[PDB]
Amino acid sequence: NDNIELVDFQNIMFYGDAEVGDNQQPFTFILDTGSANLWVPSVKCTTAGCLTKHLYDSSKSRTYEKDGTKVEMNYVSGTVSGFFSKDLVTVGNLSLPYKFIEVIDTNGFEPTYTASTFDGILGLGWKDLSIGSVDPIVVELKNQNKIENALFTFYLPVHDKHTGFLTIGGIEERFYEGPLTYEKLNHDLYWQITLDAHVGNISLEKANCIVDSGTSAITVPTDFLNKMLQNLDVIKVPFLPFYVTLCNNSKLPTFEFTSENGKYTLEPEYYLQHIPGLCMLNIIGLDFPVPTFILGDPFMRKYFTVFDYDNHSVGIALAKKNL
Amino acid sequence: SSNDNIELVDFQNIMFYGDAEVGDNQQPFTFILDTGSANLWVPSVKCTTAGCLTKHLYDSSKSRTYEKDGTKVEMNYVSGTVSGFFSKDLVTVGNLSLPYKFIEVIDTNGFEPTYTASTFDGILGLGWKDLSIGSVDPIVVELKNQNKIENALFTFYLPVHDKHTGFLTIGGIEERFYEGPLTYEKLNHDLYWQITLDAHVGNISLEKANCIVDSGTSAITVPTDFLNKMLQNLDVIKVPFLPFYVTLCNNSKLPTFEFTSENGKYTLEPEYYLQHIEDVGPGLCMLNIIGLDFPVPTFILGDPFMRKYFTVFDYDNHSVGIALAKKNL
Amino acid sequence: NDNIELVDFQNIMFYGDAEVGDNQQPFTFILDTGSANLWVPSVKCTTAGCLTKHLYDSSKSRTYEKDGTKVEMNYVSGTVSGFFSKDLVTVGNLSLPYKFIEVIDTNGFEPTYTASTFDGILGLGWKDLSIGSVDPIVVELKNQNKIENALFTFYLPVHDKHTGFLTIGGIEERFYEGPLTYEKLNHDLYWQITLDAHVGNISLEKANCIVDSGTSAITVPTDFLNKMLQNLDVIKVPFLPFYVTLCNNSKLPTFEFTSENGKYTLEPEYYLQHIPGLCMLNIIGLDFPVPTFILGDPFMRKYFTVFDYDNHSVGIALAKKNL
Amino acid sequence: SSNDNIELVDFQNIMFYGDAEVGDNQQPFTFILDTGSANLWVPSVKCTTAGCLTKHLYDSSKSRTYEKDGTKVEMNYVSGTVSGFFSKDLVTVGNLSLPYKFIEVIDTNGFEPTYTASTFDGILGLGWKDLSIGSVDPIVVELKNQNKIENALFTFYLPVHDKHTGFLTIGGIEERFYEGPLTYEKLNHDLYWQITLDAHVGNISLEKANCIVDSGTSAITVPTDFLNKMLQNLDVIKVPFLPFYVTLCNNSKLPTFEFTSENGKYTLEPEYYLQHIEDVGPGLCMLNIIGLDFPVPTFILGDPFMRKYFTVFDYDNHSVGIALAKKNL
Ligand SMILES: CCCN(CCC)C(=O)c1cc(C(=O)N[C@@H](Cc2ccccc2)[C@H](O)CNC(C)(C)c2cccc(OC)c2)cc(N2CCCCS2(=O)=O)c1
Ligand SMILES: CCCN(CCC)C(=O)c1cc(C(=O)N[C@@H](Cc2ccccc2)[C@H](O)CNC(C)(C)c2cccc(OC)c2)cc(N2CCCCS2(=O)=O)c1
Numbered sequence A, C: 001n002d003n004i005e006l007v008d009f010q011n012i013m014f015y016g017d018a019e020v021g022d023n024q025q026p027f028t029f030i031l032d033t034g035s036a037n038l039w040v041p042s043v044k045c046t047t048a049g050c051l052t053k054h055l056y057d058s059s060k061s062r063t064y065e066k067d068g069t070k071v072e073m074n075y076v077s078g079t080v081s082g083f084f085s086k087d088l089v090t091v092g093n094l095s096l097p098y099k100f101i102e103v104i105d106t107n108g109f110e111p112t113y114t115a116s117t118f119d120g121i122l123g124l125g126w127k128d129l130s131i132g133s134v135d136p137i138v139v140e141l142k143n144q145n146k147i148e149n150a151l152f153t154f155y156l157p158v159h160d161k162h163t164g165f166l167t168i169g170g171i172e173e174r175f176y177e178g179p180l181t182y183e184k185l186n187h188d189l190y191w192q193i194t195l196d197a198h199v200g201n202i203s204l205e206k207a208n209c210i211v212d213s214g215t216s217a218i219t220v221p222t223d224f225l226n227k228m229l230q231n232l233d234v235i236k237v238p239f240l241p242f243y244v245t246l247c248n249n250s251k252l253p254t255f256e257f258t259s260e261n262g263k264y265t266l267e268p269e270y271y272l273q274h275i276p277g278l279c280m281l282n283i284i285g286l287d288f289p290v291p292t293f294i295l296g297d298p299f300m301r302k303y304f305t306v307f308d309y310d311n312h313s314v315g316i317a318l319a320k321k322n323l
Numbered sequence B, D: 001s002s003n004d005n006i007e008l009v010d011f012q013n014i015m016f017y018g019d020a021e022v023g024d025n026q027q028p029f030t031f032i033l034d035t036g037s038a039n040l041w042v043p044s045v046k047c048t049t050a051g052c053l054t055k056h057l058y059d060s061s062k063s064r065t066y067e068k069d070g071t072k073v074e075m076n077y078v079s080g081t082v083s084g085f086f087s088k089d090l091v092t093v094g095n096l097s098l099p100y101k102f103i104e105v106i107d108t109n110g111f112e113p114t115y116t117a118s119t120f121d122g123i124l125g126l127g128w129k130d131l132s133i134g135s136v137d138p139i140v141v142e143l144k145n146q147n148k149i150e151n152a153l154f155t156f157y158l159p160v161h162d163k164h165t166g167f168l169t170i171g172g173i174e175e176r177f178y179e180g181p182l183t184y185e186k187l188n189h190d191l192y193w194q195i196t197l198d199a200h201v202g203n204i205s206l207e208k209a210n211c212i213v214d215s216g217t218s219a220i221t222v223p224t225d226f227l228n229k230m231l232q233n234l235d236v237i238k239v240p241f242l243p244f245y246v247t248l249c250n251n252s253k254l255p256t257f258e259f260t261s262e263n264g265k266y267t268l269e270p271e272y273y274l275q276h277i278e279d280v281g282p283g284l285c286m287l288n289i290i291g292l293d294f295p296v297p298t299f300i301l302g303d304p305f306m307r308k309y310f311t312v313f314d315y316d317n318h319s320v321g322i323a324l325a326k327k328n329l
């Protein structure tokens, strides 16, 4: 299959490379199941941040198709803006002409953008999540008969153990062990499924759970989070929504998430980030109209995940500890 | 059959507020009345922040109908975040009252300087249930479910600075507040008060746009490409680094928005979307229009539209009615 | 003597009232020995922040003298700008015509300004510290023969025990006990004196020590601070220059400051701010070209202080625990 | 008697840099050479930040002349903060070298986005000892104390975009770099390179102003009242909310600064203080002038002044010499 290497950056985040243009101009991406647009910064971007990145030049590519529709993308960390373009996009060994955003202004995305090592973002969500009604890249590959199955998988890197892969088009056995259970999407928007959630006696039945590679935390309803952390020797840190603890804290809880078909757990080792024997919890309280858990990178580090557009499902199995 | 009229007070021809009460001792608060959200909150007497010191505060200990809940909750708005916990008590809007679940806010430090600088105490959402944190049935729906009104509908007649005052009306439609036809547009989703309209600014067209009627926003938002095209050669200027557009207040070349359905036509002339900014420049105006892109191309028809048009929000028929607001009450 | 009451605000800060104009328009001030200008917001200020404050109107005062020179004041927390004016300023029972800054713009001082309960700042430093070469108010009172001694004293409030006072013109016995030792200023700029500083075996000889009522911390050279906190069970909090600990931490150190004439100590109880049994340290690391300690509110809470312009000195004694 | 000339490279006719080395293996770095500060720092190989990944880094383990110190220190600049610790090693500036104390920087996250977006690795201060953190004797003073040069002085001949390159010179004055008289102004304090001059812009006068010559600032700063008066009726506009002033690049009504002492006269015409901002507007310029008030009324004579005037910084005679820079080297 088409494997894109996922490269750990100092155990903080992971990135993958892909190319744009028939001259294959190289970019580093966040590979984000929580979004659904592809963007790269343009040679026509002149902001401070752009001068530090790899840039796209439409003039150097023969397969460029103009669109020019203005567009702005909004993220938690800020906004980028520019215009739609179309060109050849190569992800590992596969390429296809594809619509994307050429970014001209990054000043509303700072300091994040200058302070990070990615050039752009490559969304892997569903069509209805995208600005511009862009068919997802994996769907388009399948439509243009370049892969048989419109699915992709994540096997995340683990610092100083092993690298990761985004695989497009088939499921490799080498990445997981135990049973692979598929959970049906509750909406074709995010990769969002319905699970019962428990920590000890704290529970939330039929929680909406979003599998988001673009987020390095588990997000939890604020009342659930408040209940789960009391009497634990975790310290809320003032002026910020973060929590610290002793790395060796034996009181720390395990999330359990269950469907009729599978049971998934996330122990403290997957959500603790070492920072003097002290660790931050990669868990954040967030309320939405549908009580939701965002199962970000800490969950995906434990569990290999399969994202299947043909079956409208997320497949979850234990990731193999080594490759 | 008995309309409940809540008077609306203008603020700097920009925003409007209305008052309602919480508790069986009718503790008074000034609210943003917001069709763009679906929670009610008030600041608590347990809120110690500097901002809360300037506000009317809710004291549950003074109300015999208070029912503790205590579920923690944090509300996220564009202007910031407030957090607290759920409570239940009598909520009074004009002459109608009911036991209702709301958020008692204890921290407002993530909502400054907005909150201290504003004259409201809280927000009262008037959207649909699926927009609410905590799955709270909207007040007007709950009033109808409790048999306190016949029709689950409300209307907005917005105040106009120096001209007339405004009303929120629950339970029926006052003919005195509109002229010309009243046309109803079916909701495309029961979430925002969101309808489907074709949008045109002369030359530039966007068919089947999603249009959200949002009383809690003082602007019109438009897709960024549509905005860029509409301003092309207009004697308007983008202030550098900022999302804002300025022009002489006397500019005679500004466009009219036109929105159409199969049943109706609605226009918004420059006079409804210009904001005087004399502080910045003699004869200068800000275009109160912001570009914003969503997965479905969307216009947010905020206060500027609602100051022109009387609006009817009908939960039983899942629709929005639109009619020219009476220029003199 | 002229006593201005110092009113505790939720054990976070203290403020005092004074008036401007012959109609005595009332303001709440930060009373700041670390600065040397008086400003108030003007009725001509139209920014968001000003609408929430008490404002000055020159038109309503018969003793107003125009100046109109533009000026901007810069603080750590941001900037305010406006223009010089002259009018009657009343501090307790004394008034005098005095030059001050009318503030027209507060947008560079936000969110601090809107989020606080003061209207303006009343500086109590030396002439060379002031923008505009303004003679300090206490010096001017003495020059215009309204007090005999150009000195003032601080006795700070203690939450839920007792209120505070700024006294102008004489030293009240009721405020202190033990010996009052005067330390000569090393420069007529800040109220800055030379002390040897020790924590355990960590020392800095002839440190510059600035007595600053406008600051709620002790600031310490960064290397001294790093040495003093190691092996203490204090947790540096990520992304911010703050430290937390258990309120009952018995390992916490005591600052000692010595001159040839006096010895001053500051125990953990004076620098711990309660915030779940957890306390923040009111201590911040800061390096200057002259190795400096800023003895802010935590020091002034323990020690009554006398600021004497005639003798160029700071007098320090134990503050009485109750009034 | 042997001048040490370090070549200076221009950046966007805005800033300039020069290279020097640290370690007895001459590890190379690009520096801001800053008469407005008095510390040398370089980023360490132990710096793991994203910004440091783009820079030349200092590896003490590769230098035989490295001497550990390890005193922690944090430097505060207007653009932010860097922190690390003191170290001592061979520092090489052109052909002169000496063992010298400097800061090895381990964290630059409080100095972003400035630092990653810039092409420098570190800063090399050229002010007086009392301006330094840690009481470090300035490099040029230390060179003279070690008998490596005869005169503790240095000069700046700034590069000019598309015209000529620049030099920092240590130890003597090159006649080729200036024309017209060279006039020396006595320092008013041994801290910045600060001199006393009368300032005039036609009508507007400020006597005995403190003038700081500051190579590390790309602007001229002026007292805010003086700035407000000088711009009065000029066809210049303040961009709203911002501290910035714009004008047509062709404006023929812009003023000349004049500074005078009893011995000399120095002027700065519009062409030295305008910055083209074509990105914002065709034919548009930014006035590279900022208002700033200090306890003594002060002008900071940054790069724009130094691009016009050759400057001599003399530690032995406590003075600054000023002469028109040669327009063609
Ligand atoms: C060590 C790396 C840290 N980065 C922070 C970078 C600013 C993150 O892990 C991160 C990335 C994102 C993010 O927007 N991710 C989107 C992808 C992305 C990544 C970097 C820059 C821009 C955008 C992703 O598309 C968001 N997915 C959805 C929409 C599901 C999401 C996630 C979390 C909260 C949401 O609503 C507020 C929405 C969000 C977070 N947050 C959750 C935990 C702390 C609060 S937060 O900032 O809202 C964190
Ligand atoms: C009310 C009068 C003054 N305020 C300024 C507030 C700082 C506004 O006009 C205002 C209120 C809101 C708001 O969130 N409104 C929500 C209600 C509200 C009002 C005041 C304070 C907090 C909250 C309202 O519920 C938002 N409705 C939805 C969710 C439909 C909305 C509107 C606009 C943009 C959205 O998403 C990007 C979402 C948003 C704006 N903006 C429009 C103009 C610039 C972009 S913006 O910041 O997003 C403006």
Ligand SMILES: CCCN(CCC)C(=O)c1cc(C(=O)N[C@@H](Cc2ccccc2)[C@H](O)CNC(C)(C)c2cccc(OC)c2)cc(N2CCCCS2(=O)=O)c1
Pocket (backbone or CB within 6 Å): C012, C013, C030, C032, C033, C034, C035, C075, C076, C077, C112, C121, C190, C210, C212, C214, C215, C216, C217, C219, C284, C294
């Ligand atoms: C709970 C109240 C917290 N407030 C923060 C309000 C922003 C303070 O205690 C405070 C007030 C000031 C301040 O500027 N004080 C000046 C007076 C003032 C007070 C409020 C608003 C504006 C101005 C005072 O004039 C500063 N004195 C000097 C110049 C000696 C000073 C003190 C500390 C650090 C300095 O250099 C960076 C300089 C400075 C601090 N800081 C020291 C500890 C944390 C870092 S800091 O922000 O630089 C803290």
Ligand SMILES: CCCN(CCC)C(=O)c1cc(C(=O)N[C@@H](Cc2ccccc2)[C@H](O)CNC(C)(C)c2cccc(OC)c2)cc(N2CCCCS2(=O)=O)c1
Pocket (backbone or CB within 6 Å): D014, D015, D032, D034, D036, D037, D077, D078, D079, D114, D123, D192, D212, D214, D216, D217, D218, D219, D221, D290, D292, D300
């Ligand atoms: C070098 C080319 C680009 N940089 C932009 C940096 C973000 C500048 O032109 C620059 C560098 C500095 C700076 O701190 N310069 C110090 C050296 C430096 C240079 C780059 C990065 C960090 C540090 C220099 O040592 C400052 N000298 C003194 C202390 C005399 C100074 C200058 C100006 C204002 C001061 O106090 C308010 C103090 C200051 C400025 N400003 C002038 C224009 C707007 C106001 S400002 O922000 O204060 C500009």
